[PDB]
Amino acid sequence: QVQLVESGGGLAQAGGSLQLSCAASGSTSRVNAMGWYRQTPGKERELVAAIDRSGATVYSESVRGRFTISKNDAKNIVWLQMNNLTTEDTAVYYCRSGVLGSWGLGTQVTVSS
Amino acid sequence: QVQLVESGGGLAQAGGSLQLSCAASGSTSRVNAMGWYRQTPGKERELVAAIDRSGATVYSESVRGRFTISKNDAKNIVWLQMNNLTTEDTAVYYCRSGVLGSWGLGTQVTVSS
Ligand SMILES: CCC(=O)N(c1ccccc1)C1CCN(CCc2ccccc2)CC1
Ligand SMILES: CCC(=O)N(c1ccccc1)C1CCN(CCc2ccccc2)CC1
Q1: Which of chain A's residues have a Cβ under 8 Å away from the Cβ of B102?
Q2: C-alpha A36: how far from chain center
Q3: CA-CA distances (angstroms) from residue A68 to A60, A71, A83, B4, B103?
Q4: Cα angle vertex A12, ends A61, A25, to 5°?
Q5: Spatial contact of B37 and B47, defined as CB atoms under 8 Å apart
Q6: Phi and psi, residue B101, nearest 5°
């Protein structure tokens, strides 16, 4: 019952910037991860950036260093800042929510020397 | 109701390799993402690798290129292959499941020359 609304798309010139926004509404209290995906012409949809509740972020290799994901927790908004755009960035961009579950008990790894 | 069990931790020699496994049980039909996390002594727990149902993977900067996450869908197992271990990798490692939701309608971005 999460609802996601993406905005900010449009036309850019190569070397330009855009900022996308994703507004979540509905019952969002359990949502503790958010992601931006893109579908370039002809290709599989791919994760380009994600952010979790602790503020940790991860990016795909194709956008790492150029794109930045950030969030406004008080308004349930997630942003995608896209810098140094290329024609290879042309795509439909999608927002997606996630509910990350419980952890296991864990396993100790000890590296010596 | 999903239950996760991590195994395969132990003592590794500097520069050695380890393979961790995480077995999921319970009602797993909706689980469409899995992640490995680690908790270095004194520090926040951190994502190090994640995999989704389409086989896409993502890694933290600290492990990208050394660690590989893979899955056996038929047995509900995920694995973390850890190579060239150093003392900086000593930690408790945890598995975590996730349910990723619907996408939004998407927003077109078109970059020209
Ligand atoms: C990692 C993402 C994350 O954890 N969230 C998030 C989700 C989408 C977009 C931005 C952030 C939280 C979801 C729950 N909301 C709280 C409850 C609420 C309800 C209505 C208005 C304001 C707040 C805080 C942020
Ligand atoms: C990216 C993760 C993912 O999508 N999954 C997954 C989850 C945990 C660990 C490995 C993979 C699927 C979850 C549902 N199972 C299906 C049914 C079933 C039941 C009992 C035994 C075997 C299979 C297929 C794999």
Answers
A1: 2, 4, 96-97
A2: 3
A3: 11, 10, 8, 32, 19
A4: 70
A5: yes
A6: -90, -160
- Token couple for A84: 């140094």
Domain B3-98 CATH assignment equals 2.60.40.10: yes
Q: Which residues of A touch B50 (CB under 8 A)?
A: 58
Distance in Å, CA A73 to ligand 1 centroid: 5
Q: Hey, what are A2's tokens?
A: 């999460």
The one-letter amino acid at B104:
G
B24, B16, B36, B26: which is closest to B75 by C-alpha?
A: B24
**In one letter, which amino acid is B74?**
A
Indicate whether residue B63 lines ligand 2 (CB < 6 A).
Answer: no
Locate B85 and state its tokens: 């271990």
The one-letter amino acid code at A12 reads A
8 Å CB contact between A16 and A60: no
Enumerate residues 6+ apart whose C-beta is below 8 A from A2. A24, A25, A26, A27, A28, A31, A97, B101, B102
Mutate: best of B107, B110, B113, partner A, most A CBs <10 A: B107
> How was it solved?
X-ray
Query: What's the resolution in A?
Result: 1.7
Nearest CA distance, A100 vs chain B (angstrom): 4
